[PDB]
C-alpha cells in the first residue's frame, strides 16, 4: 500500500486512513448519498467544498518523484449550450502557479501539471455525448492518473489505459499542501459531481495495482444499476440487454399463454450540438421484490433470492415460467401475482454485469434469464445453456430514472 492519502466516510464526516492523517475541512453544502454514504455530492456553490490539508512531509516538491491519484467520479449529462467551452476546476492542488489539478469541461476530464517555470502538460479524457449508449455519461467511472517524471502522465478509466502525454520536459513541480474539492469557474449553476475514495500514491502505479484498486473499491458483493449505483429492491428499472442494446423489453400478452420479448429499435433523445443518444426510459419496467433478503436495507446483494415484478399498463405482474415445457429454453411470462401457484419465479441475483438465475421451488436452477430467437422474435427465456457455457444474451443492466440523465418519463 503506497497510498499517502485515502479518504473514506465515517460518522457524518470524512477521514484519511493513511498514516499521514490529512486534516479535512468540509463546507456547509456537501452531501452524502442516503444508500452509499461514501458517495459525496458537490454542487455549484461556494460552501460546497472539501479542503484536504496534507502534512508538510508529503507535499509534492520534485522534478523526479513519481506519483499517482485515483478516485471515482459520476458526471451528469451536459444538457445546456452554457456547458460548451466552460472548463471548470474540480480538484485543485495548485500553489503559486505550480502543482496539479483535475478540471472538467463538456465531455472531458482534464489532468494538468504545472512546473515552477509555468511549463504545463494537459492529459485529456474525451467522451462523446453523440453515442447510442455511453459507457461514461452519468455513470460511475474509476479514474487513475499516473505520473512518471522521466516518461509519461497516463489516464486510466475503469482500469484501462485511455491516453498518455510525455512529461519529461517539465521541471520542478511544487504542489500545494491544500487539495480543494470544489466546482471552480463553472458558469452553470445546476452542475454537480459525485466523487468517492480519493487516493494519492507516491509512485507510478502499474496496471495490476490499478486493476486491484478498481476491484477492491467496487463493493463486489453488491449488484449495481446502469449508473453504477447500488441495485435496490422496490425501485422501477428499464431493462437493457447487453447483447442487443438497441432493443427494449415488451410483453406480447399477460398470462401463461403470453411471452416477453426484445422489441427494436430504441428511439432517440437529442439537443442540437449537445447530445444525441438512444432513449433509455423505454419498455416494460422490472421491479426487484424481497423474497429471502433481510429487513436491514433495500440493497440487492450477490446470491440474494428475489422475485421479479414486471409493469404492464401501470399494473404489476410476476415474471415466471413452467419449467416442464419441452426444450432447454423456458419461455418467460408475466403472470397475475395471485395466479403464479407452483410456477417457477424465484430468481438468484448475481454480480460480471447483472445475471438472474431462475430457480424451481425445489431449489434447482432453471437457468439464466436471457433471450432466444424463435424465427425473428427474441423471446425472453430462462436457459441452463447459459449456465453450462464474454457477452451473452443473459447479461442485463437495470436503468432507473436518474436526475443526471434528464430524459422524460
Ligand atoms: C445456433 C443454434 O441454433 N444454437 C442452439 C442449439 O442448437 C443445436 C445446434 O448447435 C444447431 O446448429 C442445430 O440447428 C438445427 C436446427 O434446429 C434445424 O431446424 C436446422 O434445419 O438444422 C440444424 C441441425 O444442424 O440444432 C441443435 C439442437 O437442436 O441448441 C441449444 C440448446 O441445445 C440452444 O437452443 C442454441 O441456441 C442458443 O440458445 C441460447 C438460450 O438457450 C441463446 O438464445 C443463444 O443466443 C445468443 C445468446 O443469448 O447469447 C444470442 C444470439 O441470438 C445468438 N446468435 C445468433 C443465433 O445469431 C448468440 C450466439 O449463438 C452465440 O451463442 C454467442 O454469440 O447467442 C442461442 O444461440
Author numbering: 871 to 1221, 1229 to 1266, 1272 to 1291
Which passages does the manuscript contain on this structure?
The majority of botulinum neurotoxin (BoNT) serotypes require recognition of both the protein and the ganglioside receptor to gain entry in to the cell.
Here, we show that the cell binding domain of BoNT A3 binds three monosaccharides of GD1a receptor. Six residues of the protein interact with this receptor through several key hydrogen bonding interactions.
